[PDB]
Chain A
Amino acid sequence: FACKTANGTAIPIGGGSANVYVNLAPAVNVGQNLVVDLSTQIFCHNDYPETITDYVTLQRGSAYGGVLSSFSGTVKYNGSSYPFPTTSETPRVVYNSRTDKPWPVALYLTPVSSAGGVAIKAGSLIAVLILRQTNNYNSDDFQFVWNIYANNDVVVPTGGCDVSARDVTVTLPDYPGSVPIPLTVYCAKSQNLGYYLSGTTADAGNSIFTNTASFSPAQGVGVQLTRNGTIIPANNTVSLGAVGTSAVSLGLTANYARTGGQVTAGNVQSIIGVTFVYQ
């Protein structure tokens, strides 16, 4: 019995450990979020299937690691769901072929927010899984330890809802002018959703975001967001109604807005936060 990965390493007869670097594509689902499906990443086979049956379990103590180690969730093993981190060993999966076949493990995360996320840097540890292998022939009892790493920079969603993008950059026409902001949100199941903006503002109305450009800044102008013409102040919750599986645009537009005094030539930049809430 031996196992291999989709990203070029393996563990031979007798077990051992390996570092698995996975290109993550997490997704929200109803009541739990997929962090990683390893059934495309880890494959195992039986070396003498005519005369030996191999038994494979997920061993207790399998858990999230690194920046995810505080999170709990569930693990789907061979079609059934168990609490994760694992407090008890799963039932057995039988391997009875020389053909390498999936280790059927998928890790999920219990939602904690509306639409927030954890930003994961490429190369970060996300989980440690213990594959236990026995057979019906001798007393072999081996551990195949899979250390799961993010291969890519990614955001793991922690909410019931997810967004088309986490980091949006738009370019205004030269002053004066406006530009639409592409940003949509959807939820695994229908949710009553709102959002509010965050940032530093220049005006007594708390609605013109300061020009924080670092090189050759203009003076006298900031950035103001509107929704169909209505100004959005900071820390003022806008309702999106009921948001379901179809993506809903926030309908945001960026504008220049004067902050007082002489307007001078130069660059303009504002960084604005968007945060979702359940209503």
Chain B
Amino acid sequence: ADVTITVNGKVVA
């Protein structure tokens, strides 16, 4: 691919 998007997140109890 031309561009890569890395999405970081978190689920907190």
Contact = CB atoms under 8 A, between A and B. Distances in A.
Interface of A: 113-117, 159, 163, 165-175, 177, 179, 181, 183, 198, 209, 218, 221, 223, 225, 252, 254, 256, 263-276
Contacts, number: 105
B11 A175 contact: yes
A266 B10 contact: yes
Interface string B1-13: 1111111111111
Contacts of A177: 9
B3 A274 contact: yes
- What are the 8 tightest A-B residue pairs by CB atom distance, in nearest-first order? A273-B1, A172-B9, A268-B9, A218-B11, A274-B3, A265-B13, A175-B11, A169-B6
Interface of B: 1-13
B4 A272 contact: yes
The secondary-structure label for the interface of chain B is strand
A179 B6 CA distance: 12
Given A218-B11, A264-B11, A266-B11, A274 B6 contact: no
A179 B7 CA distance: 9
Contacts of B11: 174-175, 218, 221, 256, 263-268
B10 to A, nearest CB: 5
A58 to B, nearest CB: 32
A258 to B, nearest CB: 10
A267 B2 contact: no
Given A174-B9, A175-B11, A267-B9, A275 B2 contact: yes
Given A174-B12, A175-B12, A265-B12, A117 B2 contact: yes
A275 B1 contact: yes
